[PDB]
Amino acid sequence: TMTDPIADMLTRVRNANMVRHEKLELPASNIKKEIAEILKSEGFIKNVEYVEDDKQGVLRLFLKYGQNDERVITGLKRISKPGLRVYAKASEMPKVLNGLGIALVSTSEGVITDKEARKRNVGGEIIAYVW
Amino acid sequence: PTINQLVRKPRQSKIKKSDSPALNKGFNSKKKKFTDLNSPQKRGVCTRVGTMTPKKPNSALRKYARVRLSNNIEINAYIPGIGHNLQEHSVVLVRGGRVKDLPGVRYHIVRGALDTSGVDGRRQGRSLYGTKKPK
RNA sequence: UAGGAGCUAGCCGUCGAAGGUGGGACAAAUGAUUGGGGUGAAGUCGUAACAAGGUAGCCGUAUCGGAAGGUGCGGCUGGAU
RNA sequence: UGCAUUAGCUAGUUGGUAAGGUAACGGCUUACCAAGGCAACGAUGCAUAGCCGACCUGAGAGGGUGAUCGGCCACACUGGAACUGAGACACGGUCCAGACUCCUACGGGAGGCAGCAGUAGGGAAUCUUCCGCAAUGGGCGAAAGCCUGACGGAGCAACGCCGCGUGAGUGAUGAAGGUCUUCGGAUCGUAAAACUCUGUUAUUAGGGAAGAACAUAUGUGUAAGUAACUGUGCACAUCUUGACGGUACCUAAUCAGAAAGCCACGGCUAACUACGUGCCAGCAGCCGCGGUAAUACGUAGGUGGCAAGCGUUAUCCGGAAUUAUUGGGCGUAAAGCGCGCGUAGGCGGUUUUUUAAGUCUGAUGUGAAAGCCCACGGCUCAACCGUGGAGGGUCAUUGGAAACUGGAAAACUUGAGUGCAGAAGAGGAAAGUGGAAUUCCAUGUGUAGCGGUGAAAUGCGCAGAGAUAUGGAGGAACACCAGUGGCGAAGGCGACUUUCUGGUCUGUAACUGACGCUGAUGUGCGAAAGCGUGGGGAUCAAACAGGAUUAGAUACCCUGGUAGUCCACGCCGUAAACGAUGAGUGCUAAGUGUUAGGGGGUUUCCGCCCCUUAGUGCUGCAGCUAACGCAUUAAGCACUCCGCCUGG
RNA sequence: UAAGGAACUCGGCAAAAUGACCCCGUAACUUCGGGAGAAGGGGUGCUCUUUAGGGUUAACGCCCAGAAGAGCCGCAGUGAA
């Protein structure tokens, strides 16, 4: 009876990011795998990997860090929810950490990102201010 | 809360009970009702004139007066200054302004305005207490 | 002629504002006297509670005592042996 | 706009059926048909208030004012009815009715300041019983003319906005001078007498102005032209008048002329010192000063903040994320009913395909006047008025795109239910078996004490008081198995044997294909005591009693003893009903026992070690909070719903 | 019995006024029964239609009406008691 898929999936990442993990996964969909692709399209992790099982197979994460035993993923938060579906305008779209994060864009142009919608001139359903 | 039930019940703001409740009230003299027009000073007439002890351990006798305003509300109003023309029945003017360390009395008495003149022997507080500027 | 038709006029019944009371209802003001509360002075008496505060508390309840408190029955520790 | 401490609202109402009649519509009214229609999404009703633009401060999320200044609505002593008119149910029309006021020669006559001043009233207070229509603008008239109490001006007010002021190079840091002195002094103080000099304003005596240009007045004509020509629109160039106003302005003369006030000098906060003064006078934004040495009061010089204001009073906003969408908490601070169950509502697992509705974009129209982006123009600056796009980048007319939502068609099962194999019990309502005890009556028994006492006594004792046993009875429950045991949602559940069951849980997981959660309403339980009945007064025991103690009684001591007790028969609706933690789902260090089921290895003569489930417990990371303390039986990290809270 | 209406008187004593039937309505307070016929309002004759009641029903006709319309008369319609 969970309601936000893309948030509990996102906080499970931060659930093991705190204790310095290098390997986790998540279930799949039409979206959530391709959502996990846009993470490794920018390449914030080593590689997000293949979906295997019967229904919503585990697709890996492989958390990629810095050489000072650090972490790269500071801040992990979906902004929309069942009850509040939020949208963005392309003309006043901001920059996460003033140019040090990313903000993805979801519409029927394909689920795009901050660079992939600032020069696309569409907004959409924004999700993550991840820096 | 939820933004769902905030539609069901909005964030209603908080009220603020304002000080000096006798200065934001008029009187419909024709219909015995009350208006609310927030005067600076509503005039009145003295009924009793006396003094009062501060219950806080500062010790004095500060002079007060039982004044009835235009809208006939009886108050206890502090009479600032030293000497006065406030024996009884002086048709006076009354400000707000609470005197602390004195229970109940929270109104001043405008010196030198309506039927009193102000006090005489002041030379550092001359604009107040009814004293015209010398020479 | 002005008789019919009509009209002014005449009556005849439907609806009327206001009125008239009529009962109330509601609201406000006042009322010999009164009884709860607040402030001051605490004038006074007692010392209940805080020290296992000299005879641990606390709730629901019930009874007595002017009050403080007294007791009793279920429950709670937010208590010493 | 708000109130459910307004929930059931309407009955020509609710739909239709026919006549009206309106510029048109019909329940709009009238004869007909069914009770319908309206509703907790709060209809109904109450209370309050002209609306909007606009103002205003807010980072934005925006929302508070309406004197303003514009657009719309309503009103014209009150309440009705009509007329006329294109337009009225008519602010200086009519009639009716009412209430007030006025004149009278008493016969009847009249009037409606919320049109502009003025008067009274009330108020803290808010303009002259002002001028002129010159301009504009309107009315009927070709025009001229009248009406302008519209308007354009003057008055008056610092009430408020902008400039203007209250005017200078010198020369004693001491010329004459006191808020001090352990005075000698720097000093008010390059202040100043004693002078150079300028004339904002000001004094005051002479030019003077725009606006004040636009007509009709002043013929030739043209155009529709006309029988021809005034006429009318259209070129002159001839001439009209000006409240403000000779005010403003310009010249000169003029004296350095005639002008700033106010609160503290404590710490907030830059501006201090002496006289009284004795918690007095009094100050007082919070902390506070004064009791004979006050920097704080009150008295007086310096300065200071900044100028015609300064200060007080009251009123909206920021400061303030104490309403927390942005941007608040519910264990001990205020925030979970006592728990539920549950009606509505909200919000819901997983994976495919349709729309383009919601999303997000693109072609335009495109959003308001002083208010509002940017840059000029007009103002002596400026106060104060226009320009140019920007222009909407929000709304409409328009094209679309499907991951994600809305609807359309499917499945999977974790989640839940229906299966199967078993464990346990104090889980609720009914029938038995027996024990032990306080009370009684009797035997035996006996006679001086028995009971009760912190201290003794009341009492109960000569009837045998109790005693004492095979054995006689009653009231009521039933130590032992008894536990950080188990079951129940919670109040709770305890000798058991049985009846009817609830429900828990594990394991295999067979199946339906999420069948879920909150949970307003509603319904229950609801501990104890209290309102009462029948067993109750056996024991216990409020209330009452007795004895003394104790300095004090009947209190701490003690019993007797009433209902109430016990239970059944009716409830009331309350507890620290608290795990002081609402309920459902994901994820992050451990060890440690223990309750039930499944898993075994050795085996054990039923016991050792170990996997797992659901739990019962005890210690204990990261995270957490104000800390306590929590940390798999979270107050950690996320999601959904309800409810509650915002000083005492 | 004009006008007046308790001024009478120890005292509204006596008298006057109210009264039947039908229809509308009705308070405080309560032992929930009541109060209550509370108070307070309205109507009533005769003739004809009629659609129709009790139906006299056979049906309007046979009387009261179902009770609705339209009329007529008087100062007054349970016209007396």
TrEMBL record, chain A:
Alphabetic keyword roster? Ribonucleoprotein, Ribosomal protein, RNA-binding, rRNA-binding
Q: Which GO terms describe its cellular component?
A: cytoplasm; ribonucleoprotein complex; ribosome
Query: GO:BP terms for this protein?
Result: translation
Task: Name the PROSITE patterns for this protein.
Answer: RIBOSOMAL_S8
Where does the source fall among the domains of life?
Bacteria
Identify a single GO molecular function assigned to this protein.
structural constituent of ribosome
Does Nucleotide-binding count among this protein's keywords? no
For this protein, the record's InterPro entries field holds:
Ribosomal_uS8, Ribosomal_uS8_CS, Ribosomal_uS8_sf
- One Pfam annotation reads Ribosomal_S8
Q: Record's family?
A: Belongs to the universal ribosomal protein uS8 family.
Q: What does it do?
A: One of the primary rRNA binding proteins, it binds directly to 16S rRNA central domain where it helps coordinate assembly of the platform of the 30S subunit.
The subunit field of the Swiss-Prot or TrEMBL record says: Part of the 30S ribosomal subunit. Contacts proteins S5 and S12.
NCBIfam families associated with the record: PRK00136.1
Looking up HAMAP family in the UniProt record yields: Ribosomal_uS8_B
Put simply, this protein is called Small ribosomal subunit protein uS8
Record the organism: Staphylococcus schweitzeri
**Lineage, top ranks:** Bacteria, Bacillati, Bacillota, Bacilli, Bacillales
